[PDB]
Design a binder for this molecule. Structure first.
Ligand SMILES: *[C@@H]1O[C@H](CO)[C@@H](O)[C@H](O)[C@H]1NC(C)=O
Ligand SMILES: *[C@@H]1O[C@H](CO)[C@@H](O)[C@H](O)[C@H]1NC(C)=O
Lengths: 199, 48
């Protein structure tokens, strides 16, 4: 299955449309749609390519034809901020799900506040280093991060940068960790991190 | 006792008990056109 756009990030209160599309491998009535918040079991929103399940708000609406189909959300709420899946019957043998379009609906717009952390006495006496660079209070998650000593260390195979965390501050946050030997903290005379955001 | 139109039909009538005069207007009617993009474009339609 194709599902688009890969994320849908419009303001609350609007009308917003997800699409679900296929080859001729599938049959026209058996489309359905599902909501999943982080870590939850999915919840059935739409079946029959157009019918709401019982206990789903009248502001959701499915429609389509042939192999081009859609779910329009209307009067959007923060409760809609979730991954949304279509699915369709593979004509008779098999069950097929869509991409999981993240409904990343508009919260704020902001560039990151940033904090930068060299190695520390317990970490170094344990025979290790890990340099840390922290980003927070931003939206969208438009972030890019680069490590330097003070030229470059972003080429290091031991560098990491975890997926972004959304917050009650209506904004994303993320961390990069540059794990290293204690001999790198002996080698490099300074450590630094640089950030690109909003484009 | 009766009113008349061009077709030789009742444009109005007098009631045989209360003797008041009633117009007759025919009950509303018209065509039902279906407005459609082609079936090759969509199965959705509007109705006039
Ligand atoms: C018919 O009956 C009503 C009620 O008794 C009376 O008002 C009316 O004048 C009568 N009409 C005729 C044509 O006799
Ligand atoms: C038929 O519809 C498809 C899209 O559904 C379009 O690509 C194609 O050009 C149409 N052909 C004609 C002749 O209408």
């Amino acid at each position: 299955l194709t599902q688009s756009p890969g994320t849908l990030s419009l303001s609350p209160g609007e009308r917003a449309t997800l699409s679900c599309r296929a080859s001729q491998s599938v049959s026209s009535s058996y489309l359905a749609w599902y909501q999943q918040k982080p870590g939850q079991a999915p919840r059935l929103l739409i079946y029959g390519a157009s019918s709401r399940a019982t206990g789903i708000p009248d502001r959701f609406s499915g429609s389509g034809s042939g192999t081009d189909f859609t779910l329009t959300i209307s009067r959007l709420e923060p409760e809609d901020f979730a991954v949304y899946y279509c699915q369709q019957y593979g004509s008779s043998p098999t069950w097929t799900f869509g991409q999981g379009t993240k409904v990343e609906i508009k919260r704020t717009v902001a560039a990151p506040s940033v904090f930068i952390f060299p190695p520390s006495d317990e970490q170094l006496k344990s025979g290790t280093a890990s340099v840390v660079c922290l980003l927070n209070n931003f939206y969208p998650r438009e972030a890019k991060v680069q490590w330097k000593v003070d030229n470059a260390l972003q080429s290091g195979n031991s560098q990491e940068s975890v997926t972004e965390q959304d917050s009650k501050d209506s904004t994303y946050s993320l961390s990069s960790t540059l794990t290293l030997s204690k001999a790198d903290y002996e080698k490099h005379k300074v450590y630094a991190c640089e950030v690109t955001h909003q484009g | 006792q009766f009113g008349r139109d061009i077709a030789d039909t009742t444009d109005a009538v007098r009631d045989p008990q209360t003797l008041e005069i009633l117009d007759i207007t025919p009950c509303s009617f018209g065509g039902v056109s279906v407005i459609t993009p082609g079936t090759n474009t969509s199965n959705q339609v509007a109705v006039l």
